[PDB]
Write a protein that binds this ligand. Sequence first.
Ligand SMILES: CCCOc1ccc(S(=O)(=O)N2CCN(C)CC2)cc1-c1nc(CC)c(CC)c(=O)[nH]1
Ligand SMILES: [Mg+2]
Ligand SMILES: [Zn+2]
Length: 286
Amino acid sequence: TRELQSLAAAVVPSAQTLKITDFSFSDFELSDLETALCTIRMFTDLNLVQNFQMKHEVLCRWILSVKKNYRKNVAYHNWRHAFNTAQCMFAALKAGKIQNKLTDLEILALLIAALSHDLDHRGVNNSSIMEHHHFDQCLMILNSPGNQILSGLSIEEYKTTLKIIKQAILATDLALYIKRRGEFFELIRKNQFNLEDPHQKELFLAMLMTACDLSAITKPWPIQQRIAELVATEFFDQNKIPSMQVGFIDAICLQLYEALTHVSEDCFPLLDGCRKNRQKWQALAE
Ligand SMILES: CCCOc1ccc(S(=O)(=O)N2CCN(C)CC2)cc1-c1nc(CC)c(CC)c(=O)[nH]1
Ligand SMILES: [Mg+2]
Ligand SMILES: [Zn+2]
């Protein structure tokens, strides 16, 4: 309750002051409290606090609960990753201009899913069955006394939001992503992609989740190097790395950020950042 008072009492600077609109954003300089404030600012500027009548102290407690149920002892899959995933979702909605393509309920659900998609992760070396666990954690927090940020939704809105959240979190299973992306790229190829169709909307949301989840691969080189270190620490500690990164960028990332740019030209900086990182890793590969 110490940390709650300080957080509930604090003033929240603008999105601009907090840099959370930049695709190249980094959290290394930030304290836990500051990531909490950034998260509040994300809900606020996406109009979520207004439109769904969230009570300040409930939102605060909810963020603290989420943060608390990530394990600090895990090198990469921890609160900072979740936080960064949500900041990328925010950036893509705002600067990437995806916002206007989605409903308020969709946006509410993506933001929540982004923050919650890896809840209670124990590290890759301890083991969509895991994604079912992350969503289960998400739901438990959403239903805890004092943490009910969805209380202002009608029962109908509430069910629709949980479904989107669940799908969103399950979508972060890279196997599901590989399974489903074929259709997405194909649709883009033929310039047939259409957000008005429910099936394609849901598919887009899945792709968007993966794009944010992997967003570290798009960061300015000094930052990417740093995160790759965290990832390697988790993979191996809990010379072949540069070629691995290149394989990962080629196999998983490039096409995704390419498609995403086709959906919205303003998401280009993610693609651009990803390409530059490939250059850097490719060079080290030799
Ligand atoms: C930096 C040390 C090792 O990095 C990697 C090595 C191999 C692979 S991978 O060949 O695509 N693959 C390895 C096995 N697994 C199912 C995950 C995917 C991904 C990664 C990788 N995964 C991730 C996701 C955890 C990230 C964060 C965006 C990353 O920078 N690299
Ligand atoms: Mg995960
Ligand atoms: Zn993740």
